[PDB]
């Protein structure tokens, strides 16, 4: 059980606190003497349940938990995957390619190139980047229900920052086992942040667009806007940068409405650490919070977006 | 120039309501910030509240219950009531203008600042001594 | 509770006042001459009004886990006062109390 209660700060209500300033029993090394201590989690890791105020962590009614080692990083490395003796990978050679049909120039390798195992959600991070022209692929255009990967010829800067100095806590659960607690925040209270040049989000913005009117007719309408709803994972920029999981709003991206014919764009992040990517259930990992100020630049290379189905189909 | 005179009783009897009066020559009591400094003989100062037009105006919470301003712009001046008075309210009260000041740390869109104000031109003050 | 520095004439002075810093600051000083009212010397932490010699310099309020601390280089006789400060911190409520000051001597 956590006794929670607001973060160091001064007011206002719009606040909603976010941060929760949590204490709590403990077992030490012995199996006797207990642990009165103090952590510091998210208000998506916590939920309250019914004299203060008393919290629980959001997996404990779901599945165990896993903290991840803080030896191992998260660090996307390239990973060349090859085929074994008799077998060969085909590689398509064309400019423009839909990824479905016959390719005019192909060459074969044995491995391929270096393919990062970037996880992420709606924003397509360092990848390969298109050739002239950017490209559209889907399996199915006429069906709503089957997603639309867009790459893009041309990177789009993208800066996300955790202005946070974590403290790490190293409280002892022994013997052996230690867990790595949030201890006070140096500096001021302030949430996480992406940033996109509005100038190169209207140019990419404007190129896909053209590229649409291919596939749903040359003068047509196309209007775009942010998800429908649903996990948290779908309806955010869910991505990881300095061994946190952020997830972002991306509402100030998908708010737009063009026709047949200087500064950056800053996005609201959250940080959850106790995840269950992959829609795995048993397995909860805790991230441990990373001391300092986290600062990223990435690459925008690619969407997934999803069309709907209210039509009025010939028109917008 | 701005010339700030205050006067008051300077006697109050305890468990009454002190009345002051801050009479303000140099300018409009409408275009500025006006706050009231107390301070005991030997200690530091402390903030009384600042008063302004349109509604905006904050008081001591460690005085919540008992401070109560007001501005005059027919007569043009600044007006102070304490009510509930006693030994420890004994101290010499100021009149200062105030000008806000706006300090960005964040990333503004985020309301990650705060607002701090600074008195400039004080008055000469008036002596207030609470005693039956 | 009450301070005291006293420094040789024509030296440096520093001044400690206030908690120790939490957050961002906006230290505002004053000087007390005695039988006086409170004079404004450094508001916003190293911003003088017009009117204050380069001589009084405050520490900037970026440093976490620090007290205020007042420079005045150059000590005149005259410098010979009361020093207040006014702590605005981000993780704080409004100080509606000065911080407790420190006298300054001015030596021979």
């Known amino acids: 059980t956590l006794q929670c209660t607001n973060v160091t700060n001064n007011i206002t209500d719009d606040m909603r606190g976010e941060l929760k300033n949590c204490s709590f029993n403990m077992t030490t090394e012995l199996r006797d003497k207990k642990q009165k201590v103090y952590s510091l989690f998210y208000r998506l890791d916590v939920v309250q349940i019914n004299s203060n105020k008393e919290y629980r962590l959001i997996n404990c009614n779901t599945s165990a938990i896993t903290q991840a080692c803080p030896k191992v990083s998260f660090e996307p490395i390239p990973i060349h995957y090859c085929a074994p003796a008799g077998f060969a990978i085909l590689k398509c050679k064309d400019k423009k390619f839909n990824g479905t049909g016959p390719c005019p120039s192909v060459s074969t390798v044995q491995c391929t190139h270096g393919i990062k195992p970037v996880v992420s959600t709606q924003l397509l991070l360092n990848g390969s980047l298109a050739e002239e022209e950017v490209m559209i692929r889907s399996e199915n255009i006429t069906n709503n229900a089957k997603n639309i990967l867009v790459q893009f010829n041309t990177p789009v800067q993208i800066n996300c920052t955790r202005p946070n100095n974590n403290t790490r806590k190293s409280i002892r659960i022994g013997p052996g086992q230690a867990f790595y607690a949030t201890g006070d925040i140096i500096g001021d209270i302030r949430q996480a942040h992406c940033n996109v040049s509005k100038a190169t989000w209207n140019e990419t913005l404007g190129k896909v667009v053209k590229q649409l009117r291919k596939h749903f007719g040359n003068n047509t309408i196309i209007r775009f806007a942010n998800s429908s709803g649903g996990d948290l994972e779908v309806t955010t920029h869910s991505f990881n940068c300095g061994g946190e999981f952020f997830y972002c709003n991306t509402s100030g991206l998908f708010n737009s409405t063009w026709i047949s014919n200087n500064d950056s764009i800053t996005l609201p992040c959250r940080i959850k650490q106790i995840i269950n990517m992959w829609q795995r259930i048993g397995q909860a990992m805790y991230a441990p919070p990373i001391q300092g100020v986290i600062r990223c630049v990435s690459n925008i290379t690619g969407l997934i977006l999803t069309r709907d189905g209210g039509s009025t189909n010939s028109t917008t | 120039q701005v010339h700030l005179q205050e006067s008051g009783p300077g006697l109050v009897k305890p468990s009454e309501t002190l009345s002051l009066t801050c009479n303000v020559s140099?300018?409009?009591?409408?275009?500025?910030?006006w706050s009231w400094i107390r301070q005991p003989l030997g200690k530091q100062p402390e903030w009384i509240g600042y008063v302004h037009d349109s509604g905006d105006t904050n008081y001591n919470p460690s005085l919540k219950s008992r401070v109560h301003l007001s501005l005059d712009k027919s007569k043009n001046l600044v007006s102070l009531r304490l009510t509930g008075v006693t030994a420890a309210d004994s101290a010499i009260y100021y009149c200062?203008?105030?000008?806000?000041?706006?300090?960005?740390?964040?990333?503004?869109?985020?309301?990650?600042?705060?607002?701090?104000?600074?008195?400039?031109?004080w008055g000469k003050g008036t002596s207030v001594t609470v005693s039956s | 509770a009450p301070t005291f520095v006293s420094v040789a004439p024509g030296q440096t002075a520093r001044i400690t006042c206030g908690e120790e810093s939490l957050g961002s600051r906006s230290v505002i000083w004053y000087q007390q001459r005695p039988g006086q009212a409170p004079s404004l010397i450094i508001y916003?932490?190293?911003?003088?009004?017009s009117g204050i010699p380069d001589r009084f310099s405050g520490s900037p309020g970026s440093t976490f886990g620090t007290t205020a601390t007042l420079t005045i280089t150059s000590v005149e006789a005259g410098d010979e006062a009361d020093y207040y400060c006014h702590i605005w911190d981000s993780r704080r409520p409004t100080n509606w109390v000065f911080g407790e000051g420190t006298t300054l001597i001015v030596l021979s």
């Open positions: 916003n932490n190293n911003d003088r009004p």
């Open positions: 140099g300018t409009l009591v409408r275009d500025n910030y």
């Open positions: 200062a203008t105030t000008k806000h000041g706006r300090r960005i740390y964040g990333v503004v869109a985020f309301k990650e600042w705060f607002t701090y104000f600074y008195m400039d031109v």
